[model samples]
Each structure stands twice: as structure tokens, then as C-alpha cells.
Target: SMEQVAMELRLTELTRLLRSVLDQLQDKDPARIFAQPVSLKEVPDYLDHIKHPMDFATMRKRLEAQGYKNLHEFEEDFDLIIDNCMKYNARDTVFYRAAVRLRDQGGVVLRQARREVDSIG
Candidate 1:
């Protein structure tokens, strides 16, 4: 019989980061998001601080959090809202900035960890 050993699958760092990111993005009481009847008028003005892509429609008019039938539709609308916010460059957007983060995170594993396994005998 033969045994195999693999590089350390260290998840503590990844789990910590995921927890931190979710703490920032996730609602403190997520259930409330869909529980009550909500309206744009009831929304915080801070959301208006950004030039949403929906400026041609929703932003220019009164609207509700219209429910999506498909997951992709939800993502489309969700991403639409997250980007172009005051925290990011209106030209670049937060989504693209987060994508840049993908490369950096992947580099940690693909570049650094891969190198470790590559050098393994």
C-alpha cells in the first residue's frame, strides 16, 4: 500500500477573512430583509449617494425591491446596487475592485502554495 501527503490546507486565514467580509456585507438580522414591505422612500439617502446603473429606470422613479424569479436576475440587480457607490470610484466600481482582490487571493494559493507543492519531493 502507498500513502500520499499533500501541502497544508490551512483554512484558518481563509475562514477568518470570510467571516470578516460577511460581517461587513451581511445584514445583522438578515431575516428582516424580506420580512417587511419595503419602499425606496423608506430607504436611506446614503443609497442615493451613488449613481446606480438603474438611473435610467428605478433611480429616476419610485420603485420597490422587486423580487427576482431567477438567481442570475438577483445577482444582476445585486451587483448593480453594490457597484458605483460612494466608497468606490464611479469609473471603476466596487465589483471590479473586488475582482482585483480575486487575483491577490489566488496569488496567495496559486503562486505561493503552488510553489510550495511544486518544490515537494
Candidate 2:
């Protein structure tokens, strides 16, 4: 029962966190900002160039070694970055640009994948 309660509490906390992040992004017009398409093949290089306060090249290499080749493949992890940025009130120009780039690139890959799947079905 204690484990179950802990799980529920964790879920609730995550839900609240997600809702707050969504609210912030919505206020900032995430849909419009993220609507553009970016090539999947270029996402890693783009992110590697734009990410600040850290070495994007090193991080990109590490993630790539783990099989993450594009923004679409790392969407969930990227969402956590967005969430953390919002949670910590880290809204700045650099973070905003990274978010928009990731969102657009990931969307393009996702749509491409869906189209392929649909054609197969």
C-alpha cells in the first residue's frame, strides 16, 4: 500500500509539473513557434551548435553513441529539458531557440514516420 501511494503521489506530481510547463509554453505560443519543419538529419548538428552553457559536441557524441541520431528519437528526453527549464523559470533566448528547434525537427520526423506507417497499413 505504501508503494502504491508513493506511485500515485509521483504520478500526481509529474502531472502537475507537466501542466505548469504546458501552461507556460501555451502562453508563449508554442504551436506557432514549433510549427516549422526541420530536417531530421540535421537535428543533432543543429542542437550541437545551439545548446548553451554546455559542450554540445560532447553531449551530442555521447547521445549519438547511445543510438540517438535525431530530435525525434530524443523527444521525451527533450521534453524533460523543456519541463526543467520551465520549472526553474529558465526562460531565456537560448533555451527558447533550442526548444523551438527541437520541437520542429521532432515534429518533422514524427510526421514522416507516421506517413510511412500509414502507407504500410
Candidate 3:
């Protein structure tokens, strides 16, 4: 029972620190910073993350109509999106839109069709 007394003191201090961090971030908009994440892995992580209204399925269908193939279609565009020289600024919003292309919708995955590049080759 002697160990219990000391543990209670530490837990109280732990909670005090946890609440303090929240108190600081409470005024911060998580969205502003979340607009940019570590990777463009999912739909909600991409367009929806930026508050874009369109669903991934709709975006995918639209892109498919335009003959969109792989992430490489935006090879140049994604280069700009992933570029580390970022906003933390206003120009970053432009880059933010560029990154939205990475959304992982039904057909929006950063992938493509079959293996045979050229049978003759």
C-alpha cells in the first residue's frame, strides 16, 4: 500500500501536464495545420481534409472521363504538391490544392492497370 501513495502524486502531475497542452492548442485551428499531412494516403486525408465538398467517387469518375491514368498523370503536378518548400504562408494553399490529387478514392489510388508494358519488347 506504500507504493500507492507515491503513484497518486505522479498521476495528478501527469493530468496537469496533459490539460496544459490542450489549453494551448484549444485556441488553435487543427484544420489549418492538418491541411498538409505526411502522405496523400486516403480520400478523407486529401480533398476532404481541406474541406472540399465533392466525394472521392465523383472526383474519380470525373477524372476517368478525362482519361486520367495513374498518379504519374500528375507527375509534374504532384512534384509541386510534395515539394517541401511549403507554406507554414498563402502560397502554400495553392500547393495544398496540388496535393489534393493524391486523394485515395475508388479510382483515385496512386496506381494503375495491368503489367504488360509492351509484349513485343
How well does model 3 score by local distance difference test?
0.34
Q: Give the TM-score of candidate 2.
A: 0.30
lDDT of each: 0.35, 0.44, 0.34
* Segments of candidate 1 deviating more than 4 angstroms: 1-66, 86-121
**CA error at residue 68 for candidate 1, angstroms:** 1.1
Q: For model 3, how does the per-residue alpha-carbon lDDT over 21-111 read when each residue is reduced to its tens digit?
A: 2233222323332223434454334443342232223333434344333324423333333333243224547534433423222122222
Give the range of the ten consecutive residues with the poorest summed lDDT in model 2: 50-59
Q: Which one wins on TM-score?
A: 2
Best by lDDT: 2
Write the number of the candidate with greater lDDT, choosing between 1 and 2: 2
lDDT of 2 by residue, 1-121 (tens): 8998976665555444333333333345344433232334755554443443222232344453444433344445446544433433345666566565655554554455445434633
TM-score of 3: 0.27
TM-score on alpha carbons, each prediction: 0.24, 0.30, 0.27
What is the Å distance of residue 87 in model 2 from its true position? 3.4
Q: How many residue pairs clash in each candidate?
A: 0, 0, 0
lDDT of 2: 0.44
Across residues 1-121, which tens digit of lDDT does each residue of candidate 1 receive? 1222221222333333333332333342233331222245755554465444432124212212223322234334434433432243343754345434433443343344334333542
